[PDB]
Amino acid sequence: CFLVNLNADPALNELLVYYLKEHTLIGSANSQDIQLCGMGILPEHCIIDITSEGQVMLTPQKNTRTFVNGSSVSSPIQLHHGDRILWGNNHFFRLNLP
Amino acid sequence: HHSSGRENLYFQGMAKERRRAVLELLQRPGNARCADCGAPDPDWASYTLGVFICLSCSGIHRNIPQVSKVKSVRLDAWEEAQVEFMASHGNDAARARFESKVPSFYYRPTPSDCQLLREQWIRAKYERQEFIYPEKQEPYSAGYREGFLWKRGRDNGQFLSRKFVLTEREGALKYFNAKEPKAVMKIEHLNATFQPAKIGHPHGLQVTYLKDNSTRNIFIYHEDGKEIVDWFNALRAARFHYLQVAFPGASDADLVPKLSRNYLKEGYMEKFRKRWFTMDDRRLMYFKDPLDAFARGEVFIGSKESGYTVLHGFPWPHGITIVTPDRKFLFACETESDQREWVAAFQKAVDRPMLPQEYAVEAHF
Numbered sequence: 001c002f003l004v005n006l007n008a009d010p011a012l013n014e015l016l017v018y019y020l021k022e023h024t025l026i027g028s029a030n031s032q033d034i035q036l037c038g039m040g041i042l043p044e045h046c047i048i049d050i051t052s053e054g055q056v057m058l059t060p061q062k063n064t065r066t067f068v069n070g071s072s073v074s075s076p077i078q079l080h081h082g083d084r085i086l087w088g089n090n091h092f093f094r095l096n097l098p
Numbered sequence: 099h100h101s102s103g104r105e106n107l108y109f110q111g112m113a114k115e116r117r118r119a120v121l122e123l124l125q126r127p128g129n130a131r132c133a134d135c136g137a138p139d140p141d142w143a144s145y146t147l148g149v150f151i152c153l154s155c156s157g158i159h160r161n162i163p164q165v166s167k168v169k170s171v172r173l174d175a176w177e178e179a180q181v182e183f184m185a186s187h188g189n190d191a192a193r194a195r196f197e198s199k200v201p202s203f204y205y206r207p208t209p210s211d212c213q214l215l216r217e218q219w220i221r222a223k224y225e226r227q228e229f230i231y232p233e234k235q236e237p238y239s240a241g242y243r244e245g246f247l248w249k250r251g252r253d254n255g256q257f258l259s260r261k262f263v264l265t266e267r268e269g270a271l272k273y274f275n276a277k278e279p280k281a282v283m284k285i286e287h288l289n290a291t292f293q294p295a296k297i298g299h300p301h302g303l304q305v306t307y308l309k310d311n312s313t314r315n316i317f318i319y320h321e322d323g324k325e326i327v328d329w330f331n332a333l334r335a336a337r338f339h340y341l342q343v344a345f346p347g348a349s350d351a352d353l354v355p356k357l358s359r360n361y362l363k364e365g366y367m368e369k370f371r372k373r374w375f376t377m378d379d380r381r382l383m384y385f386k387d388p389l390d391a392f393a394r395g396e397v398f399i400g401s402k403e404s405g406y407t408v409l410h411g412f413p414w415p416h417g418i419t420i421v422t423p424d425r426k427f428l429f430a431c432e433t434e435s436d437q438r439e440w441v442a443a444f445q446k447a448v449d450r451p452m453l454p455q456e457y458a459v460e461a462h463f
């Protein structure tokens with residue numbers, strides 16, 4: 001279970017894959033388990049969780065620009081393999097599940 | 099009234115005489131539909147703008163509180179001055195004020211269009227006032243626009259920043275990844291359509307160039323919403339102006355509907371292989387991924403007259419078979435809701451008389 005950065009250039013020294021923990025913290029704060037810096041990304045921006053039942057669930061923090069397959073989300077939402085995620089201005093990621 | 103003695107309580111009662119007033123206003127000429135998306139039976143209002151709108155649009159108006167403040171016509175208490183404003187305004191008033199100067203090529207959203215289109219329509223009119231003040235339209239009215247747009251790679255599926263240039267002079271959209279441009283797309287062959295869901299991005303625009311009976315799909319987006327929509331409408335300006343000169347004698351009214359085509363239906367079906375399907379007017383394209391650059395295959399859907407029929411069942415649950423003069427194409431849908439639709443979108447083609455160019459397209463397939 002990993003996220004690809006859809007804006008990373010393979011021909012450049014750009015980090016292309018971020019791996020997810022079972023309870024993954026995403027944001028700008030050093031604490032976050034995936035640290036992203038950019039326009040409109042809070043110290044604590046998101047939370048992705050891998051369930052014991054096997055499913056992937058995204059939980060946006062309040063007052064955050066967050067889209068999943070192009071639509072905004074302000075409550076929790078289940079992710080599927082291949083779904084596309086946008087956070088803030090241009091933190092644009094795809095999801096792959098095993 | 100009040101009650102006698104020390105406590106002396108004020109009672110209001112069930113009157114609701116003021117939100118009754120506004121309700122009666124919904125029967126005035128021009129207020130039958132959403133001021134912004136045209137959806138019937140609006141039941142919300144912006145009282146600072148004095149327009150009558152649907153639930154969905156009213157949501158978008160709440161984001162613009164410096165311009166619009168909303169109340170339910172039925173579930174909200176209304177101050178007296180607020181009813182007065184509605185009474186002395188309404189949707190016809192707002193058309194004359196805020197839609198005063200709307201270029202005939204500028205795209206007007208329908209209720210089913212994506213959120214970006216509907217929000218940027220409301221903001222254009224009311225916040226920016228793009229159609230009171232012509233100066234504000236320069237981005238899509240100069241006939242030349244250039245800027246960077248995140249574009250999807252052909253096969254790698256990444257989205258990388260690339261300079262684009264729409265130029266009406268040459269009559270083409272072109273991009274550079276540079277000296278000469280990486281590609282040059284003749285405006286005669288451009289279509290543009292918003293596809294946020296497919297593209298995975300709220301600002302996702304699908305641009306198609308049709309060279310040699312093949313239709314390349316380009317998938318692009320802009321970090322800012324206004325800019326992608328300006329791009330969208332610039333493209334429409336480009337097509338329009340191109341078409342006026344390509345076809346004078348044709349009216350603007352006859353040319354606007356051609357500017358850009360939105361698909362009647364897309365979604366998966368079985369062909370058994372699962373493929374993605376796009377019904378663009380007459381060419382049923384199909385794909386491995388929806389973000390494929392080129393159709394895996396196409397299928398021409400002609401007319402009842404040219405020996406084309408669509409049929410239910412097969413000789414997945416619900417089937418639709420497209421009987422052509424050469425061969426038959428069996429398709430399986432998941433749901434009946436879809437089968438219903440997919441078939442309805444095909445029948446539109448079977449019914450209509452073919453044009454000469456459509457014979458030329460058929461002659462290929």
Ligand SMILES: [Zn+2]
Nearest residue numbers: 132135152155
């Ligand atoms: Zn509306």
